[PDB]
Design a protein that fits this description.
This protein is mostly beta strands. It is 4% helix and 48% strand. The relative contact order is 0.21. Keywords: Lipoprotein.
């Protein structure tokens, strides 16, 4: 059995500043908004005319796509939140902001010659957490297994690591990630 109690902040550890988020991102018509500040989940429709973003959010997931709310992401070389925590040093690298896209966020795959996209923000760096090789029949799914640093507008930081992109039946689009928020070396 799988209820609504199986989605959202399924794990919260206020002492360790850690937790686990699980969202159903199988629909092409929806954004799943995550608020790491309030430990809250929300969703809204996304059409060919864009989306209705809530007043407050830190990141959003559509299928395997990620967008941030004026945030910037760095893909670290660490493959564990523990490995990052132990390093005791801020990982160096260029933080990547969102890009404005008109051909990335698919909202209608019913013409699959034609594929309808939403004009939308997109973070190409955090979305690296899953690679989908479309030149293969069927496509090949390769998770980076890397730890991502998310620097939000207020200069607070989160360390995100995708745990799974499939449910127990192998259905793709059920996204589970572990985080450290707020992350401080």
């Amino acid at each position: 059995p799988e209820t609504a109690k199986d989605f959202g902040f399924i794990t919260i550890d206020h002492a360790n500043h850690s937790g686990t988020v699980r969202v159903d991102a199988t629909q092409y018509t929806k954004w799943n908004y995550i608020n790491l500040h309030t430990l809250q989940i929300d969703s809204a429709k996304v059409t060919a005319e864009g989306a209705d973003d809530p007043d407050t959010w830190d990141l959003a997931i559509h299928r395997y796509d990620v967008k941030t709310n004026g945030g910037e992401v760095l893909e670290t070389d660490y493959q564990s939140l523990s490995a990052l925590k132990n390093a005791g040093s801020m990982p160096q690298g260029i933080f990547v902001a969102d890009e404005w896209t008109t051909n990335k966020i698919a909202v209608d795959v019913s013409h699959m010659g034609y594929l309808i996209y939403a004009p939308s923000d997109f973070n190409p760096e955090l979305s690296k957490w899953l690679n989908v090789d479309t030149s293969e029949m069927p496509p090949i799914y390769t998770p980076s297994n890397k730890v991502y640093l998310l620097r939000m507008k207020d200069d607070t930081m989160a360390a995100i690591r995708l745990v799974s992109y499939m449910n127990a039946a192998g259905i793709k689009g059920y996204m589970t990630f572990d985080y450290i928020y707020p992350y401080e070396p």
